[PDB]
């Protein structure tokens, strides 16, 4: 009596749950991008599927290429922990604004 309908309800549930999660990911990306690259907004965002064993070189080149889009006279190299204050950082600093999806 109940096997089918809850499996189908979970399918239906996951549809909207995942769609909303991607909505949220886009919102975070957008907000950080506006804050970094001041007004006006010029964010034609990129989706990357990294290929096998590509992360190191890929991030190296991308980080290097973004140094003349984002000023590199501050941050980047290192910083202490940031527990004091409103929030403590969840991510590294890159001259590109980046977020991730575990598809």
């Amino acid at each position: 009596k109940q096997f089918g309908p809850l499996v189908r309800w979970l399918k239906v549930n996951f549809s909207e749950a995942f769609i909303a999660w991607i909505h949220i990911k886009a919102l975070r990306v957008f907000v950080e991008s506006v804050l970094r690259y001041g007004l006006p907004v010029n964010f034609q965002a990129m989706l990357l599927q990294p290929n096998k064993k590509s992360v190191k070189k890929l991030r190296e080149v991308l980080h290097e290429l973004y140094k003349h889009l984002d000023s590199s006279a501050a941050a980047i190299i290192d910083a202490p922990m940031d527990i004091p204050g409103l929030n403590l950082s969840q991510q590294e600093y890159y001259p590109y604004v980046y977020y991730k999806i575990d598809c």
Binding site: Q2, F3, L6, V7, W9, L10, K11, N13, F14, S15, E16, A17, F18, I19, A20, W21, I22, H23, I24, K25, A26, L27, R28, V29, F30, V31, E32, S33, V34, L35, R36, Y37, L39, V41, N42, F43, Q44, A45, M46, L47, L48, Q49, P50, N51, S54, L58, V61, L62, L69, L86, N87, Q90, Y96, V97, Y98, Y99, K100, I101, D102, C103
Partner: protein
């Protein structure tokens, strides 16, 4: 697997950044497959509000990650005998999850663009939190049904002292 979203801030017109990141980068080395995400024109508010949002959306992502993982976990815990090819049973939309995400676009039907980001996030939060509560109710209910069935199995189990 793993995918990344990158800002690609145009560098004046779109092509100059987008194609430099896609075609020039992959021609230099095909270290990643690239596609266009086409961020929507959500109405930007005040700097103070957006700074607060910079933490709001961190917390929201940290929460909805757990929410979606809960959905997947309950899907598997209900369909254990047929959980194989997991994301195909779980698929949110499309023929496959990769196909959906590589063509993702902001959904105007669920949340239209004209509103403020605060409102859009609030409605998103309503959706996902109701989803969390309904999971905790219904999937727990199916687990309870499995518990009742397993208690019947225990009744059947053992010598006649239990039977």
């Amino acid at each position: 697997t793993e995918f990344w979203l990158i800002s690609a801030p145009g560098e004046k017109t779109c092509q100059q950044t987008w194609e430099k990141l896609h075609a020039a980068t992959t021609k230099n080395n095909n270290l990643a497959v690239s596609s266009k995400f086409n961020i929507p024109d959500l109405k930007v508010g005040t700097l103070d509000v957006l700074v607060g949002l910079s933490d709001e959306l961190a917390k929201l992502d940290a929460f909805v990650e757990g929410v979606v993982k809960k959905v997947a976990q309950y899907m598997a815990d209900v369909l254990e005998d047929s959980k194989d090819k997991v994301q195909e049973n779980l698929l949110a939309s499309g023929v496959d999850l990769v196909t959906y995400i590589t063509r993702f676009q902001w959904d105007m039907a669920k949340y239209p663009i004209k509103q403020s980001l605060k409102n859009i996030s609030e409605i998103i939060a309503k959706g996902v939190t109701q989803i969390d509560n309904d999971l905790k109710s219904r999937a727990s209910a199916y687990n309870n049904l499995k518990g009742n069935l397993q208690n019947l199995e225990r009744k059947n189990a053992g010598s006649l002292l239990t039977r």
